[PDB]
Amino acid sequence: PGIVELPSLEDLKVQEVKVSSSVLKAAAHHYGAQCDKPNKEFMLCRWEEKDPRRCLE
Amino acid sequence: VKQDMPPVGGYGPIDYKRNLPRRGLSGYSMFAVGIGALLFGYWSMMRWNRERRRLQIEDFEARIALMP
Protein backbone atom coordinates (compact mmCIF):
# COMPACT_ATOMS: atom_id res chain seq x y z
CA PRO A 1 0.00 0.00 0.00
CA GLY A 2 1.59 3.23 1.18
CA ILE A 3 5.30 3.68 0.60
CA VAL A 4 7.63 4.04 3.56
CA GLU A 5 10.11 6.80 4.41
CA LEU A 6 13.55 5.45 5.26
CA PRO A 7 16.25 8.15 5.31
CA SER A 8 19.38 6.50 3.98
CA LEU A 9 23.02 6.44 5.18
CA GLU A 10 23.47 10.06 4.07
CA ASP A 11 22.47 11.10 7.59
CA LEU A 12 23.10 7.70 9.19
CA LYS A 13 26.86 8.02 9.61
CA VAL A 14 28.25 9.39 12.87
CA GLN A 15 31.29 7.85 14.55
CA GLU A 16 30.10 5.77 17.48
CA VAL A 17 31.30 5.97 21.05
CA LYS A 18 33.11 2.65 20.78
CA VAL A 19 34.05 2.04 24.38
CA SER A 20 33.06 -1.10 26.22
CA SER A 21 30.64 -2.00 29.01
CA SER A 22 32.49 -1.51 32.28
CA VAL A 23 34.21 1.78 31.43
CA LEU A 24 30.92 3.30 30.28
CA LYS A 25 29.14 2.01 33.38
CA ALA A 26 31.79 3.27 35.79
CA ALA A 27 31.89 6.67 34.10
CA ALA A 28 28.13 7.07 34.34
CA HIS A 29 27.65 9.59 37.16
CA HIS A 30 29.95 12.21 35.68
CA TYR A 31 28.51 11.45 32.25
CA GLY A 32 25.03 12.32 33.45
CA ALA A 33 26.34 15.13 35.63
CA GLN A 34 28.17 17.58 33.38
CA CYS A 35 26.87 16.60 29.95
CA ASP A 36 23.41 15.09 29.30
CA LYS A 37 21.88 18.49 29.80
CA PRO A 38 20.93 18.58 26.08
CA ASN A 39 20.03 14.90 25.79
CA LYS A 40 16.74 15.56 27.53
CA GLU A 41 15.98 17.59 24.43
CA PHE A 42 16.55 14.33 22.54
CA MET A 43 14.39 12.35 24.94
CA LEU A 44 11.63 14.96 24.82
CA CYS A 45 11.85 14.77 21.02
CA ARG A 46 11.52 11.00 21.25
CA TRP A 47 8.53 11.00 23.59
CA GLU A 48 6.68 13.89 21.93
CA GLU A 49 7.11 12.21 18.54
CA LYS A 50 7.55 8.46 18.75
CA ASP A 51 9.02 8.25 15.24
CA PRO A 52 12.77 7.70 15.13
CA ARG A 53 13.88 8.97 11.75
CA ARG A 54 12.98 12.29 13.34
CA CYS A 55 15.35 12.92 16.26
CA LEU A 56 18.55 12.12 14.31
CA GLU A 57 20.01 15.59 14.89
CA VAL B 1 44.56 -74.96 105.09
CA LYS B 2 41.65 -74.60 102.66
CA GLN B 3 41.70 -72.51 99.49
CA ASP B 4 38.15 -71.72 98.42
CA MET B 5 37.04 -68.37 96.98
CA PRO B 6 35.64 -66.31 99.86
CA PRO B 7 35.09 -62.56 100.06
CA VAL B 8 37.86 -60.87 102.01
CA GLY B 9 36.15 -59.48 105.12
CA GLY B 10 33.27 -57.91 103.19
CA TYR B 11 33.28 -55.80 100.02
CA GLY B 12 32.10 -52.31 99.21
CA PRO B 13 28.53 -51.49 98.22
CA ILE B 14 27.38 -50.74 94.69
CA ASP B 15 24.76 -48.09 93.99
CA TYR B 16 21.19 -48.71 92.85
CA LYS B 17 19.97 -45.16 92.21
CA ARG B 18 18.61 -43.88 88.90
CA ASN B 19 21.34 -41.24 88.89
CA LEU B 20 20.07 -38.40 86.69
CA PRO B 21 21.51 -34.85 86.66
CA ARG B 22 18.63 -33.24 84.65
CA ARG B 23 20.95 -30.28 83.96
CA GLY B 24 20.64 -27.63 81.27
CA LEU B 25 18.69 -24.40 81.26
CA SER B 26 15.09 -23.81 82.31
CA GLY B 27 12.20 -22.83 80.07
CA TYR B 28 12.34 -19.08 80.64
CA SER B 29 16.11 -18.65 80.32
CA MET B 30 16.56 -20.77 77.17
CA PHE B 31 13.44 -19.17 75.68
CA ALA B 32 14.68 -15.65 76.39
CA VAL B 33 18.21 -16.19 75.10
CA GLY B 34 16.85 -17.71 71.89
CA ILE B 35 14.47 -14.81 71.31
CA GLY B 36 17.25 -12.35 72.21
CA ALA B 37 19.66 -13.72 69.61
CA LEU B 38 16.70 -13.74 67.21
CA LEU B 39 16.07 -10.03 67.78
CA PHE B 40 19.80 -9.31 67.46
CA GLY B 41 19.77 -10.98 64.05
CA TYR B 42 16.67 -8.97 63.11
CA TRP B 43 18.30 -5.64 63.96
CA SER B 44 21.47 -6.40 62.01
CA MET B 45 19.33 -7.71 59.14
CA MET B 46 17.32 -4.48 59.01
CA ARG B 47 20.51 -2.38 58.95
CA TRP B 48 22.15 -4.35 56.13
CA ASN B 49 18.99 -4.42 54.02
CA ARG B 50 18.43 -0.67 54.13
CA GLU B 51 22.07 0.14 53.30
CA ARG B 52 21.82 -2.42 50.50
CA ARG B 53 18.74 -0.64 49.15
CA ARG B 54 20.77 2.60 49.11
CA LEU B 55 23.39 0.96 46.91
CA GLN B 56 20.78 -0.65 44.65
CA ILE B 57 19.18 2.77 44.12
CA GLU B 58 22.64 3.97 43.04
CA ASP B 59 22.67 1.12 40.49
CA PHE B 60 19.26 2.28 39.23
CA GLU B 61 20.64 5.79 38.81
CA ALA B 62 23.53 4.35 36.80
CA ARG B 63 21.15 2.72 34.34
CA ILE B 64 19.07 5.91 34.15
CA ALA B 65 22.04 8.11 33.27
CA LEU B 66 23.39 5.53 30.84
CA MET B 67 20.32 5.02 28.69
CA PRO B 68 19.71 7.64 25.92
JSON list of C-alpha atoms in Angstrom, two decimals:
[
{"chain": "A", "resi": 1, "resn": "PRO", "atom": "CA", "xyz": [0.00, 0.00, 0.00]},
{"chain": "A", "resi": 2, "resn": "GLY", "atom": "CA", "xyz": [1.59, 3.23, 1.18]},
{"chain": "A", "resi": 3, "resn": "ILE", "atom": "CA", "xyz": [5.30, 3.68, 0.60]},
{"chain": "A", "resi": 4, "resn": "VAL", "atom": "CA", "xyz": [7.63, 4.04, 3.56]},
{"chain": "A", "resi": 5, "resn": "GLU", "atom": "CA", "xyz": [10.11, 6.80, 4.41]},
{"chain": "A", "resi": 6, "resn": "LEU", "atom": "CA", "xyz": [13.55, 5.45, 5.26]},
{"chain": "A", "resi": 7, "resn": "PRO", "atom": "CA", "xyz": [16.25, 8.15, 5.31]},
{"chain": "A", "resi": 8, "resn": "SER", "atom": "CA", "xyz": [19.38, 6.50, 3.98]},
{"chain": "A", "resi": 9, "resn": "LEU", "atom": "CA", "xyz": [23.02, 6.44, 5.18]},
{"chain": "A", "resi": 10, "resn": "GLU", "atom": "CA", "xyz": [23.47, 10.06, 4.07]},
{"chain": "A", "resi": 11, "resn": "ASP", "atom": "CA", "xyz": [22.47, 11.10, 7.59]},
{"chain": "A", "resi": 12, "resn": "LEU", "atom": "CA", "xyz": [23.10, 7.70, 9.19]},
{"chain": "A", "resi": 13, "resn": "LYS", "atom": "CA", "xyz": [26.86, 8.02, 9.61]},
{"chain": "A", "resi": 14, "resn": "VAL", "atom": "CA", "xyz": [28.25, 9.39, 12.87]},
{"chain": "A", "resi": 15, "resn": "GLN", "atom": "CA", "xyz": [31.29, 7.85, 14.55]},
{"chain": "A", "resi": 16, "resn": "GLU", "atom": "CA", "xyz": [30.10, 5.77, 17.48]},
{"chain": "A", "resi": 17, "resn": "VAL", "atom": "CA", "xyz": [31.30, 5.97, 21.05]},
{"chain": "A", "resi": 18, "resn": "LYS", "atom": "CA", "xyz": [33.11, 2.65, 20.78]},
{"chain": "A", "resi": 19, "resn": "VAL", "atom": "CA", "xyz": [34.05, 2.04, 24.38]},
{"chain": "A", "resi": 20, "resn": "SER", "atom": "CA", "xyz": [33.06, -1.10, 26.22]},
{"chain": "A", "resi": 21, "resn": "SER", "atom": "CA", "xyz": [30.64, -2.00, 29.01]},
{"chain": "A", "resi": 22, "resn": "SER", "atom": "CA", "xyz": [32.49, -1.51, 32.28]},
{"chain": "A", "resi": 23, "resn": "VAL", "atom": "CA", "xyz": [34.21, 1.78, 31.43]},
{"chain": "A", "resi": 24, "resn": "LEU", "atom": "CA", "xyz": [30.92, 3.30, 30.28]},
{"chain": "A", "resi": 25, "resn": "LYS", "atom": "CA", "xyz": [29.14, 2.01, 33.38]},
{"chain": "A", "resi": 26, "resn": "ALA", "atom": "CA", "xyz": [31.79, 3.27, 35.79]},
{"chain": "A", "resi": 27, "resn": "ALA", "atom": "CA", "xyz": [31.89, 6.67, 34.10]},
{"chain": "A", "resi": 28, "resn": "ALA", "atom": "CA", "xyz": [28.13, 7.07, 34.34]},
{"chain": "A", "resi": 29, "resn": "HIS", "atom": "CA", "xyz": [27.65, 9.59, 37.16]},
{"chain": "A", "resi": 30, "resn": "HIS", "atom": "CA", "xyz": [29.95, 12.21, 35.68]},
{"chain": "A", "resi": 31, "resn": "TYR", "atom": "CA", "xyz": [28.51, 11.45, 32.25]},
{"chain": "A", "resi": 32, "resn": "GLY", "atom": "CA", "xyz": [25.03, 12.32, 33.45]},
{"chain": "A", "resi": 33, "resn": "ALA", "atom": "CA", "xyz": [26.34, 15.13, 35.63]},
{"chain": "A", "resi": 34, "resn": "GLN", "atom": "CA", "xyz": [28.17, 17.58, 33.38]},
{"chain": "A", "resi": 35, "resn": "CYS", "atom": "CA", "xyz": [26.87, 16.60, 29.95]},
{"chain": "A", "resi": 36, "resn": "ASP", "atom": "CA", "xyz": [23.41, 15.09, 29.30]},
{"chain": "A", "resi": 37, "resn": "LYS", "atom": "CA", "xyz": [21.88, 18.49, 29.80]},
{"chain": "A", "resi": 38, "resn": "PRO", "atom": "CA", "xyz": [20.93, 18.58, 26.08]},
{"chain": "A", "resi": 39, "resn": "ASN", "atom": "CA", "xyz": [20.03, 14.90, 25.79]},
{"chain": "A", "resi": 40, "resn": "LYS", "atom": "CA", "xyz": [16.74, 15.56, 27.53]},
{"chain": "A", "resi": 41, "resn": "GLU", "atom": "CA", "xyz": [15.98, 17.59, 24.43]},
{"chain": "A", "resi": 42, "resn": "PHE", "atom": "CA", "xyz": [16.55, 14.33, 22.54]},
{"chain": "A", "resi": 43, "resn": "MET", "atom": "CA", "xyz": [14.39, 12.35, 24.94]},
{"chain": "A", "resi": 44, "resn": "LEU", "atom": "CA", "xyz": [11.63, 14.96, 24.82]},
{"chain": "A", "resi": 45, "resn": "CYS", "atom": "CA", "xyz": [11.85, 14.77, 21.02]},
{"chain": "A", "resi": 46, "resn": "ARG", "atom": "CA", "xyz": [11.52, 11.00, 21.25]},
{"chain": "A", "resi": 47, "resn": "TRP", "atom": "CA", "xyz": [8.53, 11.00, 23.59]},
{"chain": "A", "resi": 48, "resn": "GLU", "atom": "CA", "xyz": [6.68, 13.89, 21.93]},
{"chain": "A", "resi": 49, "resn": "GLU", "atom": "CA", "xyz": [7.11, 12.21, 18.54]},
{"chain": "A", "resi": 50, "resn": "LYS", "atom": "CA", "xyz": [7.55, 8.46, 18.75]},
{"chain": "A", "resi": 51, "resn": "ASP", "atom": "CA", "xyz": [9.02, 8.25, 15.24]},
{"chain": "A", "resi": 52, "resn": "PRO", "atom": "CA", "xyz": [12.77, 7.70, 15.13]},
{"chain": "A", "resi": 53, "resn": "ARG", "atom": "CA", "xyz": [13.88, 8.97, 11.75]},
{"chain": "A", "resi": 54, "resn": "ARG", "atom": "CA", "xyz": [12.98, 12.29, 13.34]},
{"chain": "A", "resi": 55, "resn": "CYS", "atom": "CA", "xyz": [15.35, 12.92, 16.26]},
{"chain": "A", "resi": 56, "resn": "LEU", "atom": "CA", "xyz": [18.55, 12.12, 14.31]},
{"chain": "A", "resi": 57, "resn": "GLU", "atom": "CA", "xyz": [20.01, 15.59, 14.89]},
{"chain": "B", "resi": 1, "resn": "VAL", "atom": "CA", "xyz": [44.56, -74.96, 105.09]},
{"chain": "B", "resi": 2, "resn": "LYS", "atom": "CA", "xyz": [41.65, -74.60, 102.66]},
{"chain": "B", "resi": 3, "resn": "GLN", "atom": "CA", "xyz": [41.70, -72.51, 99.49]},
{"chain": "B", "resi": 4, "resn": "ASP", "atom": "CA", "xyz": [38.15, -71.72, 98.42]},
{"chain": "B", "resi": 5, "resn": "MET", "atom": "CA", "xyz": [37.04, -68.37, 96.98]},
{"chain": "B", "resi": 6, "resn": "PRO", "atom": "CA", "xyz": [35.64, -66.31, 99.86]},
{"chain": "B", "resi": 7, "resn": "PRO", "atom": "CA", "xyz": [35.09, -62.56, 100.06]},
{"chain": "B", "resi": 8, "resn": "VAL", "atom": "CA", "xyz": [37.86, -60.87, 102.01]},
{"chain": "B", "resi": 9, "resn": "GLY", "atom": "CA", "xyz": [36.15, -59.48, 105.12]},
{"chain": "B", "resi": 10, "resn": "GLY", "atom": "CA", "xyz": [33.27, -57.91, 103.19]},
{"chain": "B", "resi": 11, "resn": "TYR", "atom": "CA", "xyz": [33.28, -55.80, 100.02]},
{"chain": "B", "resi": 12, "resn": "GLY", "atom": "CA", "xyz": [32.10, -52.31, 99.21]},
{"chain": "B", "resi": 13, "resn": "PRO", "atom": "CA", "xyz": [28.53, -51.49, 98.22]},
{"chain": "B", "resi": 14, "resn": "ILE", "atom": "CA", "xyz": [27.38, -50.74, 94.69]},
{"chain": "B", "resi": 15, "resn": "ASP", "atom": "CA", "xyz": [24.76, -48.09, 93.99]},
{"chain": "B", "resi": 16, "resn": "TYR", "atom": "CA", "xyz": [21.19, -48.71, 92.85]},
{"chain": "B", "resi": 17, "resn": "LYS", "atom": "CA", "xyz": [19.97, -45.16, 92.21]},
{"chain": "B", "resi": 18, "resn": "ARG", "atom": "CA", "xyz": [18.61, -43.88, 88.90]},
{"chain": "B", "resi": 19, "resn": "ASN", "atom": "CA", "xyz": [21.34, -41.24, 88.89]},
{"chain": "B", "resi": 20, "resn": "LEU", "atom": "CA", "xyz": [20.07, -38.40, 86.69]},
{"chain": "B", "resi": 21, "resn": "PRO", "atom": "CA", "xyz": [21.51, -34.85, 86.66]},
{"chain": "B", "resi": 22, "resn": "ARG", "atom": "CA", "xyz": [18.63, -33.24, 84.65]},
{"chain": "B", "resi": 23, "resn": "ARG", "atom": "CA", "xyz": [20.95, -30.28, 83.96]},
{"chain": "B", "resi": 24, "resn": "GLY", "atom": "CA", "xyz": [20.64, -27.63, 81.27]},
{"chain": "B", "resi": 25, "resn": "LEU", "atom": "CA", "xyz": [18.69, -24.40, 81.26]},
{"chain": "B", "resi": 26, "resn": "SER", "atom": "CA", "xyz": [15.09, -23.81, 82.31]},
{"chain": "B", "resi": 27, "resn": "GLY", "atom": "CA", "xyz": [12.20, -22.83, 80.07]},
{"chain": "B", "resi": 28, "resn": "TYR", "atom": "CA", "xyz": [12.34, -19.08, 80.64]},
{"chain": "B", "resi": 29, "resn": "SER", "atom": "CA", "xyz": [16.11, -18.65, 80.32]},
{"chain": "B", "resi": 30, "resn": "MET", "atom": "CA", "xyz": [16.56, -20.77, 77.17]},
{"chain": "B", "resi": 31, "resn": "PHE", "atom": "CA", "xyz": [13.44, -19.17, 75.68]},
{"chain": "B", "resi": 32, "resn": "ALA", "atom": "CA", "xyz": [14.68, -15.65, 76.39]},
{"chain": "B", "resi": 33, "resn": "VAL", "atom": "CA", "xyz": [18.21, -16.19, 75.10]},
{"chain": "B", "resi": 34, "resn": "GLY", "atom": "CA", "xyz": [16.85, -17.71, 71.89]},
{"chain": "B", "resi": 35, "resn": "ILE", "atom": "CA", "xyz": [14.47, -14.81, 71.31]},
{"chain": "B", "resi": 36, "resn": "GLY", "atom": "CA", "xyz": [17.25, -12.35, 72.21]},
{"chain": "B", "resi": 37, "resn": "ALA", "atom": "CA", "xyz": [19.66, -13.72, 69.61]},
{"chain": "B", "resi": 38, "resn": "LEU", "atom": "CA", "xyz": [16.70, -13.74, 67.21]},
{"chain": "B", "resi": 39, "resn": "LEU", "atom": "CA", "xyz": [16.07, -10.03, 67.78]},
{"chain": "B", "resi": 40, "resn": "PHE", "atom": "CA", "xyz": [19.80, -9.31, 67.46]},
{"chain": "B", "resi": 41, "resn": "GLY", "atom": "CA", "xyz": [19.77, -10.98, 64.05]},
{"chain": "B", "resi": 42, "resn": "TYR", "atom": "CA", "xyz": [16.67, -8.97, 63.11]},
{"chain": "B", "resi": 43, "resn": "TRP", "atom": "CA", "xyz": [18.30, -5.64, 63.96]},
{"chain": "B", "resi": 44, "resn": "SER", "atom": "CA", "xyz": [21.47, -6.40, 62.01]},
{"chain": "B", "resi": 45, "resn": "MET", "atom": "CA", "xyz": [19.33, -7.71, 59.14]},
{"chain": "B", "resi": 46, "resn": "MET", "atom": "CA", "xyz": [17.32, -4.48, 59.01]},
{"chain": "B", "resi": 47, "resn": "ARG", "atom": "CA", "xyz": [20.51, -2.38, 58.95]},
{"chain": "B", "resi": 48, "resn": "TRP", "atom": "CA", "xyz": [22.15, -4.35, 56.13]},
{"chain": "B", "resi": 49, "resn": "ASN", "atom": "CA", "xyz": [18.99, -4.42, 54.02]},
{"chain": "B", "resi": 50, "resn": "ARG", "atom": "CA", "xyz": [18.43, -0.67, 54.13]},
{"chain": "B", "resi": 51, "resn": "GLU", "atom": "CA", "xyz": [22.07, 0.14, 53.30]},
{"chain": "B", "resi": 52, "resn": "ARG", "atom": "CA", "xyz": [21.82, -2.42, 50.50]},
{"chain": "B", "resi": 53, "resn": "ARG", "atom": "CA", "xyz": [18.74, -0.64, 49.15]},
{"chain": "B", "resi": 54, "resn": "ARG", "atom": "CA", "xyz": [20.77, 2.60, 49.11]},
{"chain": "B", "resi": 55, "resn": "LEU", "atom": "CA", "xyz": [23.39, 0.96, 46.91]},
{"chain": "B", "resi": 56, "resn": "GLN", "atom": "CA", "xyz": [20.78, -0.65, 44.65]},
{"chain": "B", "resi": 57, "resn": "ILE", "atom": "CA", "xyz": [19.18, 2.77, 44.12]},
{"chain": "B", "resi": 58, "resn": "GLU", "atom": "CA", "xyz": [22.64, 3.97, 43.04]},
{"chain": "B", "resi": 59, "resn": "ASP", "atom": "CA", "xyz": [22.67, 1.12, 40.49]},
{"chain": "B", "resi": 60, "resn": "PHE", "atom": "CA", "xyz": [19.26, 2.28, 39.23]},
{"chain": "B", "resi": 61, "resn": "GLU", "atom": "CA", "xyz": [20.64, 5.79, 38.81]},
{"chain": "B", "resi": 62, "resn": "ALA", "atom": "CA", "xyz": [23.53, 4.35, 36.80]},
{"chain": "B", "resi": 63, "resn": "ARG", "atom": "CA", "xyz": [21.15, 2.72, 34.34]},
{"chain": "B", "resi": 64, "resn": "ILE", "atom": "CA", "xyz": [19.07, 5.91, 34.15]},
{"chain": "B", "resi": 65, "resn": "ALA", "atom": "CA", "xyz": [22.04, 8.11, 33.27]},
{"chain": "B", "resi": 66, "resn": "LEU", "atom": "CA", "xyz": [23.39, 5.53, 30.84]},
{"chain": "B", "resi": 67, "resn": "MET", "atom": "CA", "xyz": [20.32, 5.02, 28.69]},
{"chain": "B", "resi": 68, "resn": "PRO", "atom": "CA", "xyz": [19.71, 7.64, 25.92]}
]
